[PDB]
Design a protein around this ligand. Structure first.
Ligand SMILES: CNC(=O)COc1cc2cc(Nc3nc(N4C[C@H](C)C[C@H](C)C4)ncc3Cl)ccc2n(C)c1=O
Ligand SMILES: CNC(=O)COc1cc2cc(Nc3nc(N4C[C@H](C)C[C@H](C)C4)ncc3Cl)ccc2n(C)c1=O
Ligand SMILES: CNC(=O)COc1cc2cc(Nc3nc(N4C[C@H](C)C[C@H](C)C4)ncc3Cl)ccc2n(C)c1=O
Ligand SMILES: CNC(=O)COc1cc2cc(Nc3nc(N4C[C@H](C)C[C@H](C)C4)ncc3Cl)ccc2n(C)c1=O
Ligand SMILES: CNC(=O)COc1cc2cc(Nc3nc(N4C[C@H](C)C[C@H](C)C4)ncc3Cl)ccc2n(C)c1=O
Ligand SMILES: CNC(=O)COc1cc2cc(Nc3nc(N4C[C@H](C)C[C@H](C)C4)ncc3Cl)ccc2n(C)c1=O
Ligand SMILES: CNC(=O)COc1cc2cc(Nc3nc(N4C[C@H](C)C[C@H](C)C4)ncc3Cl)ccc2n(C)c1=O
Ligand SMILES: CNC(=O)COc1cc2cc(Nc3nc(N4C[C@H](C)C[C@H](C)C4)ncc3Cl)ccc2n(C)c1=O
Lengths: 122, 122, 122, 122, 122, 122, 122, 122
C-alpha cells in the first residue's frame, strides 16, 4: 500500500526544536511568574489541552502574550516545554510534584499518569 | 536516565494534522498553479528544505502567501503535504514522476531517494 | 463479463478526503461541544446511520449546521470522521471507550463491534 | 498499530450508489445531448479529472447544471457513471470506442488504459 | 431451427436497471417504513410472487403507491430490489436474516432457498 | 462477494411475456398499418432504440397509442416483438428482409447485424 | 405419390400461438383459481383429453367459460398451455410435481410419462 | 433446457382433422360456387393469409358464412383444405393450375412456390 517512516516524526520534532532554539517563527510568549518562554502555538496545542482550548478560541488565537497564573511552578513548565519538543521528560524526586501539578494545569493526561507511576514505583 | 516515548512523535504529528484539517493557526497559503493549500510554516520547514531556506530568511518569514512556480505538479505537492503531516506517502505508478520531481523542487532528499527505489523495484 | 477495479473505491475515498482537507464542496458543519467539523453530507450518510436517518429526512436534508448533543466526546467523533474518509481507525486504550460510545450514538455497528473485539483481545 | 478494513470502501461506495438511486443529496445535473443524469459532485470529482478541474474552480463549484458538449456519447457517459459508483465497467465490443473516447474527455486515465488493453487483447 | 441469444436476457435486465436508475417509466412507489423505492411494476411481478398476487388483481393494478408492512426490514428489501434488476444478491452474515425474512414475505422461494444454503454452509 | 443467478434474467423475461399474453399492465398500443399490438413500454425501451428515444421524451412518455409508419412490415414487427420478450428470433429466408428493415427502423443494431450474418451464411 | 412438409405443422402451431397472443378468435376462458386464460377450443381438444371429453359433449361445446377445480395449480396449467401451443415444456425441479399432477388432471398421458422420466433421471 | 416433441404438431393436426371430419366446433362455412365446406377459423388463419386478413378484422371475425368469389375452382380449394389439415398436397398435372391459382387467391406463398417447382420439374 504505502511506506511508513518510523523516524520521520522524531526528525520533525527535532527540527521544530532547532527553530525554537533559534527563535524562528516563535509567535507566542508564555509568561510564568517572572519568566518568559517563546514557543510555537501549534506545538503547544499539539501537546497541551489547555493551550488547545485557548488557541482554539478565535478570541485567543492571535494572542501574542499568554499570561499564566503566577502560581504555576516555572520548573514544571520549562521541563514540560522541553519534553513537548523533545519527548524526553526530566522527572526527578526534587521536581516530580511541580511537574505533576503543572501537567494537571496544562491538561497533559499522559504526563500526569506517568508522574503517578513515578511515585508509585519510587 | 530518562524515559523514551516511542509513540509521542506520532501523536504530535496526528494532532498537528487535526489542527490543519480544522484550519487552526494555519498561517500560510501555498499557491500552486490555481490551487491553494493552507499549512503551518513550522511543519513545512521541518519537512522541506526549500521552505526551510525560504522561512529561514527574515525577509520571507512573515510572508502569508507563498507562490510556487506554476510548473510544479499539484498532485506531487498535495501528496507530499499529506505525507508531511501523516508520514504516509501515496506513491503509485501514475504519480511517481510528479512526486519525484516535486520532492526535488521541495528538497526532500529522502523522498526522492524513495522514488528512486520505487521505480528501481517496479 | 466485466472488469473489477479492486483499488477504485480506495482512490475515490482518497480524493474525497483531499477535497475535505481543502474544504471543497463541504456543505455541512458538525458542531460537537465547542468544536466545528466541516464534512460532506453524502459521506456522512454513507458511513453513519444517524446521519443517514437525519439527512434522509427532507426536513433536515438542507440543514447547513448539525448540532450534536454536547455529551458526545470530540475525540470519538474526530477519530471516527477521519476513519470515515480513510478507513483507518486510531483505536487505543486511552480513547477506545469514547470511540465505542460515539459509534453507538452515530450507529456505526461495525465500529462498535470492533471496539468490542478490541477490549476482548486486550 | 491500527486495523485495516478491506471491505469498508466497497460498502461506502455501495451506500453512495443507494443514495444516488434514491436521489438523496444529488446536487448536480449532468446534461449530455438530450439526457439528464443526477449525481453527487464529490463522487464525480473523486473519479473524474475533468469534473475535478471544474468543481475545483470556485466559479463552477456551485453550478447545479453542468452542460457537457453534445458530442459526448451518452452510452460512454452512463456506463462510466455506473462504473464510478460500482467499480464495474460494462465494456463490450459494441461500446468500447464510445467509452474510451468519453474516458478521454472525462480524463479517466486508468479507464482509457483499460480500453487500450481491451482492444489489444480482443 | 432458430438462434439462441445467451446474453440477451442479461442485456435486457441491464437496460431495465438503467431506466430505473434514471427514473424512466417507474410507475410505482414502494413505501417501506420511512423509505421510498421507485420501481417498475412488471419487474416486480416478474421477480416477486407477492407483487404478482397484488398487481394481478385488477383492484391493485393501477395502485401508484404500495405501502408494505412497517415490519419489513429495508435492508432486506433494497438488497432484494437490486438483485431483482441485477441478479446479484449481496448476502452477508450481517443481513442474511433480514433478507431471508423479506424474501419469505415477498415470496421469493429461490432466494429463501439460497439463504437456507448460506447459513447451512457458513 | 455475491452470488450470480445465471437464469434469473430469463425467468424475468418469461414472466413478463406471461403478463403480456394476459394483457396485464400493458400500457401501450402499437399501431402498425391495420394491426394493433399491446406491449409494455419498459420492455420496448429496453430492447428498442427508437422506442427508447420516443419514451425518453417526456412529451411522448404518456402516449397510450404509438402510430408507426404504415410502411413498416407487420411480420418484421411481430417477429421482433416476440423476440424482445422471448430472445428467440424466427428468422427465415421468407421474412429475413422485412425483419432486417424493421430492425433498422426500430434501431436494433444486434438484430440487423444478425440479419447481415444470416444472408452472409445462406 | 405426394410431398411431405416436415415443418408445416410447426408453422401452423406457431401461427396459432400468434393468434392466441393477439386474442384472435380465442373463444374460451379457462378459470383456474383466480387466474383467467384465453385459448382456442380446438387446440385444447387437440392436446388435452379432459378438454376433449368436455368439448365433445354438445352440452359443453358452446361454453364460453370453463371453471376448473380451484385445486389445480396455475403454474402447472400455464406451463402446459404454453407447451400445447409451442411444444416446449418448461419442466424444472421446482414445478415438476405441479405439472405432473395437472397433466394427470388434463389427461396428457405423454406429459405425465415425461414427468415420470424426469424425476427418474434426476 | 427443455424437451422437444418432434411429432407433437403432427398429432395436433391429426386430431384437428378428426374434429373437422366429425363436425366438432366447426364454426365457419366456406361457400365456393355451389359447394359448402365447414372448417375451423383458427386453422384457416394459421394456413391462409386471405383468411388471416379476413378473420383478423373484427368486422369479419364472427362471420359464420364466408362467400368466396364463384370464380375460385372448388378442386383447388378442397385439395388445399385437406392439405391445410393434413400437410399432404394432392398435386397432379390435371389440377396443378387450379391449385396454383387458388393458392394465389388464398395467399399460400409456399404452396404457389411448390406449384412453380412442380411444372418446372415436369
Ligand atoms: C504525552 N502527551 C500528553 O500527555 C498529551 O495528552 C493530551 C494531549 C492533548 C492535545 C490537545 N491538542 C489538540 N487537540 C485536538 N483535539 C481535541 C481532542 C480532545 C480530541 C481530538 C480529536 C482533537 N486537536 C488539535 C490539537 Cl493541537 C488537546 C488536549 C490534549 N489533552 C487533554 C491531553 O491529555
Ligand atoms: C523524509 N524526510 C525528508 O525527506 C526530509 O529531508 C530533508 C529535510 C529537511 C528539513 C529542513 N528543515 C529544517 N532544517 C534545519 N536545519 C538545516 C539543515 C541543513 C541542517 C540542520 C542542522 C538544521 N533546521 C530547521 C528546519 Cl525546520 C531543511 C532541509 C531538509 N532537507 C534538505 C531534506 O532533505
Ligand atoms: C465500517 N462501517 C460501519 O460500521 C457502518 O455500518 C453502518 C452503516 C450505515 C450506513 C448508512 N447509510 C446509508 N444507508 C442506506 N440504507 C439504509 C440501510 C439500513 C439499508 C440500505 C439498504 C439503505 N442508504 C444510504 C446510506 Cl448513505 C445507514 C446506516 C448504517 N448503519 C446503521 C451501520 O451500522
Ligand atoms: C479507475 N480510476 C480512474 O481511471 C481515475 O483516474 C483519475 C482520477 C482523477 C481524480 C481526480 N479527482 C481529484 N483529484 C484530486 N487531486 C488532483 C490530482 C491530479 C492529484 C491529487 C494529489 C489531488 N483531488 C481531489 C479529487 Cl476529487 C482528478 C483527476 C483524475 N485523473 C486525471 C485520473 O486519471
Ligand atoms: C430467483 N427468483 C426467485 O426466487 C423468484 O421465484 C418466484 C418467482 C415468482 C414470480 C411471479 N411472477 C409472475 N408469476 C406468474 N405466474 C404465476 C406462477 C405461480 C406460475 C406461472 C405459470 C404464472 N406470471 C407472471 C408473473 Cl410476473 C410470481 C410468483 C413467484 N414466486 C412465488 C417465486 O417463488
Ligand atoms: C439484441 N438486442 C439489440 O439488438 C438491442 O440493441 C440496442 C438496444 C437499445 C436499447 C435502448 N434502450 C435503452 N437505452 C438506454 N440508454 C441509451 C443508450 C444509447 C446507452 C445507455 C447507456 C442508456 N437506457 C435505457 C433504455 Cl430502456 C436504446 C437503444 C438501443 N439500441 C440503439 C440498440 O441497438
Ligand atoms: C404430447 N401430447 C400428449 O401428451 C397428449 O396426449 C393425449 C392427447 C389427447 C387428445 C385428445 N383430443 C382429441 N381426441 C380425439 N379422439 C379421442 C381419442 C381417444 C382417440 C382418437 C381416435 C379420437 N379426437 C379429437 C381430439 Cl381434439 C383427447 C385425449 C388425449 N389424451 C387422452 C392424451 O393422452
Ligand atoms: C405451407 N404453408 C403456406 O404456404 C402458408 O404460408 C403463409 C401462411 C400465412 C399464414 C397466415 N396466418 C396468420 N398470420 C399471422 N401473422 C401475419 C403474418 C404476415 C406475420 C406473422 C408475424 C403474424 N398471425 C396469425 C395467423 Cl393465423 C397469414 C398469412 C400467410 N401467408 C401470407 C402465407 O404465405
Amino acid at each position: 500500500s504505502c511506506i511508513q517512516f518510523t523516524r520521520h516524526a522524531s526528525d520533525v520534532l527535532l527540527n521544530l526544536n532547532r527553530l525554537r532554539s533559534r527563535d524562528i517563527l516563535t509567535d507566542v510568549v508564555i509568561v510564568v511568574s517572572r519568566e518568559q518562554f517563546r514557543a510555537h502555538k501549534t506545538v503547544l496545542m499539539a501537546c497541551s489541552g489547555l493551550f488547545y482550548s485557548i488557541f482554539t478560541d478565535q478570541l485567543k488565537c492571535n494572542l501574542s502574550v499568554i499570561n499564566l497564573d503566577p502560581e504555576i511552578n516555572p520548573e514544571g513548565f520549562c521541563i514540560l516545554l522541553d519534553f513537548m519538543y523533545t519527548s524526553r521528560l526530566n522527572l526527578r524526586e526534587g521536581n516530580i510534584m511541580a511537574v505533576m501539578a503543572t501537567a494537571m494545569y496544562l491538561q497533559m493526561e499522559h504526563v500526569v499518569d506517568t508522574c503517578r507511576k513515578f511515585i508509585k514505583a519510587s
